[PDB]
Design a protein around this ligand. Structure first.
Ligand SMILES: O=C(CN1CCCCC1)Nc1ccc2c(c1)OCO2
Length: 330
């Protein structure tokens, strides 16, 4: 089997991407944030504290003839950005882009943190990291991808995120029309439960490539590109007036600037992030100070190849017995 679904930016900055997901019988369609940095499929629901729901579409398990309470199971997740959610668990039928999994754990939120409430466009998350990170207790549950894997034509999914435009998540096949040149594959460590890999270096603008190992995660659920302070300083040094602002929480730059590109290495291959992709717009409405899309990972504990990086590529998440990642230009 295969599936194919369009993923759409939530706003004009590509702060996140939402993908429609059918849950239950009859289907209830929720727009979920596909997150290769976590492993829980959770949704706003009829059980979510009412004051914590503000415009989201909810899953109502009592209206699904295929929903079953997973007795005794609870979940609770805290994302690295400080957001969180928790609740209980149903199994139900879940379909993405025509690919159906029966008996998928659907984690129903009883509580969500303010950042989730305040984002009316995201109805929940669909985790695509390794199932070892799943938070369901006392019996850990599998991700949608792990459940689907054995049925797929090939045990892969691909992320093709758009810049200020829709893109695609495919399951079970590699669309050879969706990228240019060849896909370069690179090793993955699953030791921390992530799609963790080592970039071979970087360049800023038209500058020389610096060969250096940068260990990080391919994370569709993180907006920005978080890299070591040395790398990030080298980038922003090429932008007149750019500075790190402790009050704002990162590098800012004059909105009048033209940003240089940023290149990262994948083996001997190179992915170029255009300068425009690194502009996250005014820090507050009307400001002439703009927020940078490349930020330091110091204090995070890991480098994160978030959407800023991934959207410049066609990305293969190869879930074969020994997982790998593939990157192609597009
Ligand atoms: O928390 C995030 C992104 N966040 C995920 C949940 C939905 C809203 C966006 N990413 C992140 C990814 C890895 C990290 C980390 C943070 O801090 C430590 O490691």
């Amino acid at each position: 089997s295969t599936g194919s679904a369009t993923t759409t930016p939530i706003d004009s900055l590509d702060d996140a991407y939402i993908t429609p997901v059918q849950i239950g019988t009859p289907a209830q369609t929720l727009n979920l944030d596909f997150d290769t940095g976590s492993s829980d499929l959770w949704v706003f629901s009829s059980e979510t504290t009412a004051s914590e729901v503000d415009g989201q579409t909810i899953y109502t398990p009592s209206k699904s003839t295929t929903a079953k309470l997973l007795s005794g199971a609870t979940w609770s997740i805290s994302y690295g950005d400080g957001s969180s959610s928790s609740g209980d668990v149903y199994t139900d039928t879940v379909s993405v882009g025509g690919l159906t999994v029966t008996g998928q754990a659907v984690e129903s939120a009883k509580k969500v943190s303010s950042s989730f409430t305040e984002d009316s466009t995201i109805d929940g998350l669909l985790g695509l990291a390794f199932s070892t990170l799943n938070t369901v207790s006392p019996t850990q549950q599998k991700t949608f991808f792990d459940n689907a894997k054995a049925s797929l034509d090939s045990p892969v999914f691909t992320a093709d995120l758009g810049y200020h435009a829709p893109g695609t998540y495919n399951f079970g096949f590699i669309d050879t029309t969706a990228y240019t040149g060849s896909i370069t594959y690179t090793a993955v460590s699953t030791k921390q439960g992530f799609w963790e890999w080592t970039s071979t270096g970087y360049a800023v603008g038209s500058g020389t490539f610096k060969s250096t190992s940068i260990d990080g995660i391919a994370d569709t659920g993180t907006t920005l590109l978080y890299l070591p302070a040395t790398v990030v300083s080298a980038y922003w040094a090429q932008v007149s007036g750019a500075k790190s602002s402790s009050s704002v929480g990162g590098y800012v730059f004059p909105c009048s600037a033209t940003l240089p590109s940023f290149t990262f290495g994948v083996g001997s291959a190179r992915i170029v992030i255009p300068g425009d992709y690194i502009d996250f717009g005014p820090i507050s409405t009307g400001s002439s100070s703009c927020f940078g899309g490349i930020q330091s990972s110091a204090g995070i504990g890991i480098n994160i190849f978030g959407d800023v990086a991934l959207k410049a590529a066609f990305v293969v998440f190869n879930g074969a017995t020994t997982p790998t990642l593939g990157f192609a230009s597009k």
